Amino acid sequence: GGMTGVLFSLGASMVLGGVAQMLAPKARTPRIQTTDNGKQNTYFSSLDNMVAQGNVLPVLYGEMRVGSRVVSQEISTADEGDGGQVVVIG
Amino acid sequence: TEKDITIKGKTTSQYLASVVMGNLPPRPFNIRMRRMTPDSTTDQLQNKT
Numbered sequence: 001g002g003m004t005g006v007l008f009s010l011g012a013s014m015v016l017g018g019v020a021q022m023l024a025p026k027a028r029t030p031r032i033q034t035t036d037n038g039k040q041n042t043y044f045s046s047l048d049n050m051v052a053q054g055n056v057l058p059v060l061y062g063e064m065r066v067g068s069r070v071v072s073q074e075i076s077t078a079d080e081g082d083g084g085q086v087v088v089i090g
Numbered sequence: 091t092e093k094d095i096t097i098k099g100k101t102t103s104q105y106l107a108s109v110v111m112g113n114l115p116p117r118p119f120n121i122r123m124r125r126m127t128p129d130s131t132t133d134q135l136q137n138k139t
Binding site: 089 | 098
């Protein structure tokens with residue numbers, strides 16, 4: 001137990017994947033679909049309304065106009081009324 | 091007077107409209123409406139509300 005044989009140095013065994021990978025951990029590209037055609041969406045953009053069923057609530061960090069997750073949509077009859085008494089319908 | 095309403099348009103159908111208000115006063119209270127146009131004397135004017 002005094003000695004520690006089999007030092008087993010690791011050099012190119014970790015370089016073999018690439019050198020910038022051992023300084024920066026790289027990024028994950030999304031999966032490409034077919035019905036989506038060629039619109040390569042990323043993981044930090046959403047310009048359409050989503051559905052909030054058993055999903056997570058997204059967060060925003062700066063600028064970059066985004067869509068939303070619809071929680072309630074309803075149509076009723078538009079009653080006549082303003083912020084006052086002027087209610088002419090002639 | 092809480093609110094007014096005025097209608098100006100030729101129609102011979104039973105037309106119903108809706109106006110909303112915010113019930114700021116609490117506790118049971120009373121509500122009324124009053125017609126300002128005098129009742130028609132002849133049968134030519136059928137403006138009934």
